[PDB]
Short mmCIF file of C-alpha atoms (C1' of nucleotides) and ligand atoms in Angstrom, two decimals:
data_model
loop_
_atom_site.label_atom_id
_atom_site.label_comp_id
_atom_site.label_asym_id
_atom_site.label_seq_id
_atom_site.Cartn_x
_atom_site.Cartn_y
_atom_site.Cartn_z
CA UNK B 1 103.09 130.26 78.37
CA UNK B 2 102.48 129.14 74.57
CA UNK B 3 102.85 126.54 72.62
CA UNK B 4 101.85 128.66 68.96
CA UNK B 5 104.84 129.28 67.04
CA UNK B 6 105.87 132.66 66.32
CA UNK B 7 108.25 135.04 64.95
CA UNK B 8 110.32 135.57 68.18
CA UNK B 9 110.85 131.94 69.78
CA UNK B 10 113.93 133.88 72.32
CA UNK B 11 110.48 135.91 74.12
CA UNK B 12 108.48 133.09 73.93
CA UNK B 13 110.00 130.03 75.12
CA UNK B 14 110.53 131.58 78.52
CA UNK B 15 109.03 129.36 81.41
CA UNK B 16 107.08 131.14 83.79
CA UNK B 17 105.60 129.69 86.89
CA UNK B 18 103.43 130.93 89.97
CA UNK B 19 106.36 130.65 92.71
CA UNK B 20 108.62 133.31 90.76
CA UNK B 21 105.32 135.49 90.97
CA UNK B 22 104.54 134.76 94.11
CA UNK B 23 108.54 136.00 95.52
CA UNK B 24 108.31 138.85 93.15
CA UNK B 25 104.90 140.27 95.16
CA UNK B 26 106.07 140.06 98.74
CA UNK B 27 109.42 142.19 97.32
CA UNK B 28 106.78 144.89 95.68
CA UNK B 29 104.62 144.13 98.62
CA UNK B 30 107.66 145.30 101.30
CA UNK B 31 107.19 148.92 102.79
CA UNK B 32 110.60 149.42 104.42
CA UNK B 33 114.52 148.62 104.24
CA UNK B 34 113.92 146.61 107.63
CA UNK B 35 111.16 144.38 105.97
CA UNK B 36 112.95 143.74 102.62
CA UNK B 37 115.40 142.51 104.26
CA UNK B 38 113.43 139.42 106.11
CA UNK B 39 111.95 138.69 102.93
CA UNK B 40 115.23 138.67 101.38
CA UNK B 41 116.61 136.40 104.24
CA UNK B 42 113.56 133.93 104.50
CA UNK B 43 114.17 133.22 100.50
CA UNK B 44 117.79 133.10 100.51
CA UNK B 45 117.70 129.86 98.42
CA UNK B 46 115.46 130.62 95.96
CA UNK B 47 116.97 133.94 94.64
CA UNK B 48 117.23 134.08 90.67
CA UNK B 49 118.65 137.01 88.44
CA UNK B 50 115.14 138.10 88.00
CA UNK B 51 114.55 138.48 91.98
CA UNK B 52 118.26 139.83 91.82
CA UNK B 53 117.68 142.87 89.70
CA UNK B 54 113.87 143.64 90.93
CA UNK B 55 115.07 144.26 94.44
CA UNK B 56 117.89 146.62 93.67
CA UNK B 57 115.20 148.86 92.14
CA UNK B 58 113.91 148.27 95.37
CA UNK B 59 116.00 150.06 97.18
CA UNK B 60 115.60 152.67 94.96
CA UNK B 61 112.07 153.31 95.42
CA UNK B 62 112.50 152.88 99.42
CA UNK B 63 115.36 155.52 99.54
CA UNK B 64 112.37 158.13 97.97
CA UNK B 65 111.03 158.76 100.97
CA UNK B 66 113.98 159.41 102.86
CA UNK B 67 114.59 162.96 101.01
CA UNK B 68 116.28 164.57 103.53
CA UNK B 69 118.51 162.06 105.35
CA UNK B 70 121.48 160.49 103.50
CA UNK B 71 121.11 156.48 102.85
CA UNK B 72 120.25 154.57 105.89
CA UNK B 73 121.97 151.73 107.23
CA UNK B 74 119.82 148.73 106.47
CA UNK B 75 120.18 150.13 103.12
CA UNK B 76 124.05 150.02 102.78
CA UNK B 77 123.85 146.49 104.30
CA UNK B 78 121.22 145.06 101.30
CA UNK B 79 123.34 146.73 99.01
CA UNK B 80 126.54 144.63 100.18
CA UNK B 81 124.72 141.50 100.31
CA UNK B 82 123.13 142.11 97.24
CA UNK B 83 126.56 142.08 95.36
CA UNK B 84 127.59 138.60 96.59
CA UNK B 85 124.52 137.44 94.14
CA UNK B 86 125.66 139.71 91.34
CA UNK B 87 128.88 138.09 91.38
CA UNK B 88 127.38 135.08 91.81
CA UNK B 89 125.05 135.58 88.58
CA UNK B 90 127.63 138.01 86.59
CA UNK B 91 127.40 135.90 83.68
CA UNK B 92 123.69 135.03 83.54
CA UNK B 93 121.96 138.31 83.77
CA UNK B 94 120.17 139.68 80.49
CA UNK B 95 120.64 143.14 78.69
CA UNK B 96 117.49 144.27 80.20
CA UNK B 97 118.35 142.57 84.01
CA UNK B 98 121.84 144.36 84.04
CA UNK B 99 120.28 147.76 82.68
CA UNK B 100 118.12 147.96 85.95
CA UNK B 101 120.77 146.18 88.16
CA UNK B 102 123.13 149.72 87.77
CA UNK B 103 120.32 152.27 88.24
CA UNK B 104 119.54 150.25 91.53
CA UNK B 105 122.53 150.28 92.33
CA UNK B 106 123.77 153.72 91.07
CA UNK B 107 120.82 155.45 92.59
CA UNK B 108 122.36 154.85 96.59
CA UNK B 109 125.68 156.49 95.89
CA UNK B 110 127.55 153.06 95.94
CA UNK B 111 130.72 151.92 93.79
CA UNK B 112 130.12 148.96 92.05
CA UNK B 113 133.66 146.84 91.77
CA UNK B 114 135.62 147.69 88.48
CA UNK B 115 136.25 143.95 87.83
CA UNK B 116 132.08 143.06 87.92
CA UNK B 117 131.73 146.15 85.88
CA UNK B 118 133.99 144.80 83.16
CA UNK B 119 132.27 141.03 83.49
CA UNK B 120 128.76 142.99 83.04
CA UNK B 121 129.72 144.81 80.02
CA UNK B 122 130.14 142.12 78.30
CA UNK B 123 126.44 141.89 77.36
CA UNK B 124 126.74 144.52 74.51
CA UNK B 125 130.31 144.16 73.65
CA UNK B 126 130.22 140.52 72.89
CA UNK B 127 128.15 139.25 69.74
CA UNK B 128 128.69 142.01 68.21
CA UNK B 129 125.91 144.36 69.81
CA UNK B 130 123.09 141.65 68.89
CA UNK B 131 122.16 141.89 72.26
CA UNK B 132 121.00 145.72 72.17
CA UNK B 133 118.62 145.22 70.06
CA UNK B 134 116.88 142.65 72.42
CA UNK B 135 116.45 145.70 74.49
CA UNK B 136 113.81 147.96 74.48
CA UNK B 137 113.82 151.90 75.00
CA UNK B 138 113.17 151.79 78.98
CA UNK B 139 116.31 149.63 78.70
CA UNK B 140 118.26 152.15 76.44
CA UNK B 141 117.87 154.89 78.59
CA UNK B 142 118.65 153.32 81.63
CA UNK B 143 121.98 151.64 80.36
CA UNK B 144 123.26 155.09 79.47
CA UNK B 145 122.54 156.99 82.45
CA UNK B 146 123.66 154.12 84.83
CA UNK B 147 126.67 153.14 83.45
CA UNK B 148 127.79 156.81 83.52
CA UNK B 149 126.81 157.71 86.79
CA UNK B 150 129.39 154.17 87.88
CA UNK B 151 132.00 156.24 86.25
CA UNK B 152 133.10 153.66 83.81
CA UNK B 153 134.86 154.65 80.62
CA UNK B 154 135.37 152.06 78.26
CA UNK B 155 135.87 153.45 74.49
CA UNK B 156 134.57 149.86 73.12
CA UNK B 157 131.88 149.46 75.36
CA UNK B 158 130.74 152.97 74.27
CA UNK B 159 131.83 152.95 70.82
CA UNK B 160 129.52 149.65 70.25
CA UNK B 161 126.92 150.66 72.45
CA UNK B 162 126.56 153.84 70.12
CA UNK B 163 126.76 152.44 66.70
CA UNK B 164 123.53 149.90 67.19
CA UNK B 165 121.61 152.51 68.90
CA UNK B 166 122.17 155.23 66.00
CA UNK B 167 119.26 153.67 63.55
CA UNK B 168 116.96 153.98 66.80
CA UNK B 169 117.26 157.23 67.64
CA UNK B 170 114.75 159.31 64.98
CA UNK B 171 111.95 156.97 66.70
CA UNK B 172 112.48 157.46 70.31
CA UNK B 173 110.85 159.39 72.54
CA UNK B 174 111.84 162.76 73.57
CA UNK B 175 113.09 162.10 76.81
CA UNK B 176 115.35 159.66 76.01
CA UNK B 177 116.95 161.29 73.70
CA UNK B 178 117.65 164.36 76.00
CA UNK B 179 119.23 161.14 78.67
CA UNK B 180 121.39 159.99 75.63
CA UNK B 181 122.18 163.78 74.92
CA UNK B 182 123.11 164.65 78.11
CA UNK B 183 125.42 161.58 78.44
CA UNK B 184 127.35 162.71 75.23
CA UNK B 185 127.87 165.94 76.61
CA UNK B 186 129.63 164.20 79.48
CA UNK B 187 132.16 162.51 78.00
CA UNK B 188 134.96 163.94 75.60
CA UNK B 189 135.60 161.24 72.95
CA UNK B 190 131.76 161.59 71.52
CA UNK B 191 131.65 165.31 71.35
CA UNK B 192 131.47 166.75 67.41
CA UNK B 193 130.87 163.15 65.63
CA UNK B 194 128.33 161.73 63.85
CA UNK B 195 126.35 160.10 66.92
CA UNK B 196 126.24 163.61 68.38
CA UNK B 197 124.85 165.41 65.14
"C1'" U K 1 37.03 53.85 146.76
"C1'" C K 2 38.60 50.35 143.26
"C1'" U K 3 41.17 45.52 140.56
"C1'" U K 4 42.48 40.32 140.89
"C1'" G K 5 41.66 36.45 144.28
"C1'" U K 6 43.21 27.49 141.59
"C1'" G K 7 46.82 30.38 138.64
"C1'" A K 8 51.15 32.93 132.85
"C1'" C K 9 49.34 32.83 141.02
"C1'" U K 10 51.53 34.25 145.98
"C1'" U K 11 55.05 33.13 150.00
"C1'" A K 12 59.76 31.16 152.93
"C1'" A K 13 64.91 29.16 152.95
"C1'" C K 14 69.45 28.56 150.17
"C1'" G K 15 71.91 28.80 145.45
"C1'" U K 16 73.30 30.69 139.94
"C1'" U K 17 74.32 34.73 135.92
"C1'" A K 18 78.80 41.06 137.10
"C1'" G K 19 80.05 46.44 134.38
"C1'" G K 20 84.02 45.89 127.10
"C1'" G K 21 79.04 42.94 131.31
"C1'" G K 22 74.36 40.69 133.31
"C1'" C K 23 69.03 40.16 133.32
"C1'" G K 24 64.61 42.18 130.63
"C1'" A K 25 55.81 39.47 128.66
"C1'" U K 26 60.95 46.64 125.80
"C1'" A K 27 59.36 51.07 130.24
"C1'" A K 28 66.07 52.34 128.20
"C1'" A K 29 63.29 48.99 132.81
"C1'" C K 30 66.27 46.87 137.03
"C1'" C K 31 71.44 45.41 138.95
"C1'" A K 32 71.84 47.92 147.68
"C1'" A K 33 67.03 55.39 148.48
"C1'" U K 34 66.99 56.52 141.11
"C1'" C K 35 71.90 53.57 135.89
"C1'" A K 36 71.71 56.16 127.89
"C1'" C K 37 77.03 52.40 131.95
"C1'" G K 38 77.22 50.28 139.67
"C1'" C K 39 80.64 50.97 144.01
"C1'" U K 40 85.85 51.37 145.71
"C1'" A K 41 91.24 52.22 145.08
"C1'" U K 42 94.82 53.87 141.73
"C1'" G K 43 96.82 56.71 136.98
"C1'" G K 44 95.75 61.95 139.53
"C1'" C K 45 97.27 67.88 142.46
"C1'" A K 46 93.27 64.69 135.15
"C1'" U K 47 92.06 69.22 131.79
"C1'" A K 48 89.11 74.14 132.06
"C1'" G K 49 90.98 80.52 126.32
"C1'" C K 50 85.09 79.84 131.84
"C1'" U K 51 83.11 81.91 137.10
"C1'" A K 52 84.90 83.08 141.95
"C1'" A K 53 89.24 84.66 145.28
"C1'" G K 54 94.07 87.10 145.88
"C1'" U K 55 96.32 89.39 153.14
"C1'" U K 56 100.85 96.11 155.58
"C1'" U K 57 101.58 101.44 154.70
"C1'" C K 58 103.58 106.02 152.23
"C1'" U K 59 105.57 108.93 147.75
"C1'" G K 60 106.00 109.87 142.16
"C1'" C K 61 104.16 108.70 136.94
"C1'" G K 62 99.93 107.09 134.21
"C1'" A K 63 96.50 104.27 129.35
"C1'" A K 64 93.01 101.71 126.14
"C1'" A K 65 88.19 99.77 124.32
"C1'" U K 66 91.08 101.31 117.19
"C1'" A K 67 93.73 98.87 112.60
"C1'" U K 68 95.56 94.04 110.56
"C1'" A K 69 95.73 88.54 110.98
"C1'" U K 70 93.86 84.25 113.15
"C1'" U K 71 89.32 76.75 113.75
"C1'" U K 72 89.34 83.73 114.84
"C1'" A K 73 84.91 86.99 116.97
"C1'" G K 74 83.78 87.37 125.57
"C1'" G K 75 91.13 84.20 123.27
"C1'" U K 76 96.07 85.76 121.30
"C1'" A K 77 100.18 88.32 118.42
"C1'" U K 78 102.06 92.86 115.87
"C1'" A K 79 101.29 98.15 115.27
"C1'" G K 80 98.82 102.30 117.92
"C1'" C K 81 98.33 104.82 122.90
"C1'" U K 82 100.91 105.79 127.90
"C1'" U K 83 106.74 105.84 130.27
"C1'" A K 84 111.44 106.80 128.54
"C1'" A K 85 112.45 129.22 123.70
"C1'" A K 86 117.95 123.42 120.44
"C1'" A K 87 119.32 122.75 115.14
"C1'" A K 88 117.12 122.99 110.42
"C1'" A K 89 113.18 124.88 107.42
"C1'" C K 90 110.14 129.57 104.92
"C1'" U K 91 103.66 127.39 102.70
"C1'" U K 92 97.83 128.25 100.94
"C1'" U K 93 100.63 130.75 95.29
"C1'" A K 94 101.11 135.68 89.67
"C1'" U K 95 104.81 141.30 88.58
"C1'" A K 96 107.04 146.64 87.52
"C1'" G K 97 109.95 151.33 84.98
"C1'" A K 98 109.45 156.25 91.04
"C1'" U K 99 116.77 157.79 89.85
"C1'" A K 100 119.17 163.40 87.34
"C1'" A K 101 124.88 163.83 90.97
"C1'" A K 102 127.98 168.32 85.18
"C1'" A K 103 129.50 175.23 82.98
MG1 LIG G 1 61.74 56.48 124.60
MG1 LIG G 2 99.39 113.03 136.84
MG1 LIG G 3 93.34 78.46 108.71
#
RNA sequence: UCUUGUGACUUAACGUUAGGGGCGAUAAACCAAUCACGCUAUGGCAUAGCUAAGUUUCUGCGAAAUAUAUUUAGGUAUAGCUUAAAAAACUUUAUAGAUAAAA
């Protein structure tokens, strides 16, 4: 934390404080489904968005291992309780919080609830798209891929999304381009326009 | 062994002054076997935060010697001590980009 002033007063008046840290480590820290879930369940009251959307990549990264079998129980059960916070938080997530909230979430196989879909897209259809440029390109590429693996298809959540992220794409890098690429490819209402060309 | 031994002497009988007192060539001396207030009865089973003592058996539980205040310091009061696998809570501190399902 800072006191200078700066050019960017949105990234820099952001408190940040040892116990959020210290939450944040036993999650990383956690080396199975069964002990993420006592961590979860010894913090219950001091769960914020932030602690929200790290441990859905959590699951993630646990479900790696398990190559072969299909997604494990304790897994399905996190992912259930999970949502009830989601819902709980649906409008006070960030562009960058609900872009690795659906690849957690999309990455076990599981349907998130058209209605908290709709609620979450809010973030880049309202203000006109001022939001996306908040986000960066780890952000980009995971809000294209994860909202189409949910299966929602939303003309003016996709019609904004790709008008402010046309300047950007010249300048970034080439995998994330072949994501976005692959995306258009995928769904019929952006193939021969101007954001495929 | 020593002092005085016709004198401010010694002795016998009876009498006078009484305790908030008497008497005293003053030693606080004497006033019925030891007086800086006699003896006896009563108030009176005076008062003692001090010392001593406290009488048959069996079963169960079980301390303290610190703090504060005190005409208080070897006394007493208050607090402390002793008797009388539930619920709830998450604590010894700081951080990432790992998924690829469609001719
Ligand atoms: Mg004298
Ligand atoms: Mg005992
Ligand atoms: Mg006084």
């Amino acid at each position: 934390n800072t006191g200078v002033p700066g050019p960017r007063p949105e990234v820099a008046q952001k408190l940040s404080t040892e116990y959020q840290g210290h939450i944040l480590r036993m999650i990383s820290l956690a080396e199975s489904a069964s002990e993420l879930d006592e961590v979860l369940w010894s913090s219950k009251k001091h769960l914020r968005p932030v602690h929200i959307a790290r441990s859905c990549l959590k699951l993630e990264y646990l479900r790696t291992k398990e190559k072969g079998r299909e997604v494990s129980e304790p897994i399905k059960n996190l992912a259930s309780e999970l949502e009830n916070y989601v819902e709980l938080y649906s409008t006070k997530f960030t562009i960058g919080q609900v872009s690795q909230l659906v690849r957690g979430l999309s990455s076990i196989r599981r349907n998130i609830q058209p209605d908290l879909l709709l609620k979450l897209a809010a973030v880049v259809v309202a203000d006109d798209g001022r939001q996306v440029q908040l986000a960066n390109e780890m952000d980009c590429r995971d809000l294209f891929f994860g909202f189409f693996s949910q299966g929602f298809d939303n003309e003016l959540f996709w019609k904004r999304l790709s008008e402010s992220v046309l300047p950007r794409l010249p300048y970034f890098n080439a995998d994330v381009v072949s994501t976005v690429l692959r995306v258009v490819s995928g769904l019929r209402f952006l193939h021969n326009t101007e954001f495929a060309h």
